[PDB]
Design a protein around this ligand. Structure first.
Ligand SMILES: Nc1c(O)cccc1C(=O)O
Ligand SMILES: Nc1c(O)cccc1C(=O)O
Ligand SMILES: [Fe+2]
Ligand SMILES: [Fe+2]
Ligand SMILES: [Fe+3]
Ligand SMILES: [Fe+3]
Ligand SMILES: [O]
Ligand SMILES: [O]
Lengths: 176, 176
């Protein structure tokens, strides 16, 4: 039996309202419950990003407020999947995805799983000129909010990491 | 890389509207995507039930439409956790819970995980007179919609299974 480790139910719209100032730059996402198997986050905007995420497990999306879209690699081709207000979406493992969240006040429920030891997440960048993989970092992810920054920053700070090994074009880095 | 196995995003309110006739007796719940790790269901009403679920993994709740409540066993005592319209809630593993969904047209998003082989779900009934455990079935759950019925029915059909081993009171069975 036992204890309601994660607290009682609570009103989600009110919660999103009250954390609105973190669903903006420079924070943008916010985890609901700590130390749980289900990683439950609300992601706001605006945030554009240049990395593609390779998640070894599924990701559930429910775009509660406003609109966003996912840049994908599907079947070897760049595709866009729109997250219009009201949309839900389940992403299979390892589909590369780059969330674009251009609207302020937007809010997306994203649910993922804690990765077991040895199951790594990948973060990738691709050449705008030729489309080859430019750089990949693999990470044992412990914090969907926190392990990402230093990894993006070390890509941004390194012309070496950003240099396409197929055509030599140096990826632009922080912004597309 | 690869394929959007689960299809493209789609409008969730419209989906719930169109499956409304299954979010009623005798169906009541409806799984969104098949053969996925995340088991994503919408549960409507009315449905009252007498069993407590012992889930070996977490359960996420988002009560989108209308109100419901969870009869719980918390710290050895009967407790009620209300799922008011708008509430989200994360249930820890093995907290015994009996969802009560009295409103027609209600709709709750419930997300769970596929149980790995050997990780069993329990379904339990407790004596209204003395509170002792009356009957427990453990099951390797493959279908959150479908493995439950025959299990509830075999409890309902058996005075033996329904007989409290502490005080001899025969549990009422189908309805409280
Ligand atoms: N999909 C995301 C992820 O895995 C981590 C952080 C944010 C997102 C997102 O949808 O923006
Ligand atoms: N929590 C539930 C479960 O695990 C299975 C089916 C339905 C529910 C519910 O919330 O009603
Ligand atoms: Fe290139
Ligand atoms: Fe009893
Ligand atoms: Fe991701
Ligand atoms: Fe349950
Ligand atoms: O992501
Ligand atoms: O449940």
């Amino acid at each position: 039996r036992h204890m309601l480790t994660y607290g009682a139910p609570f009103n989600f719209p009110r919660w999103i309202d009250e954390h609105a100032h973190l669903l903006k730059p420079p924070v943008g996402n916010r985890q609901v419950w700590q130390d749980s198997d289900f990683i439950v986050t609300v992601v706001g905007g605006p945030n554009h990003r240049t990395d593609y995420h390779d998640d070894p497990l599924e990701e559930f999306f429910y775009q509660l407020r406003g609109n966003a879209y996912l840049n994908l690699w599907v079947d070897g081709r760049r595709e866009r999947a729109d997250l219009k207000e009201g949309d839900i979406f389940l992403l299979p493992p390892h589909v590369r995805h780059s969330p674009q969240r251009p609207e302020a006040g937007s809010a997306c429920l994203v649910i993922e799983r804690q990765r077991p030891a040895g199951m790594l997440d990948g973060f990738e960048w691709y050449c705008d000129a030729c489309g080859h993989l430019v750089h990949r970092v693999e990470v044992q992810l412990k914090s969907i909010v926190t392990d990402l920054p230093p990894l993006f920053e070390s890509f941004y700070a390194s012309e070496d990491k950003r240099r396409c090994p197929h055509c030599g074009q140096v990826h632009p880095g922080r912004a597309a």
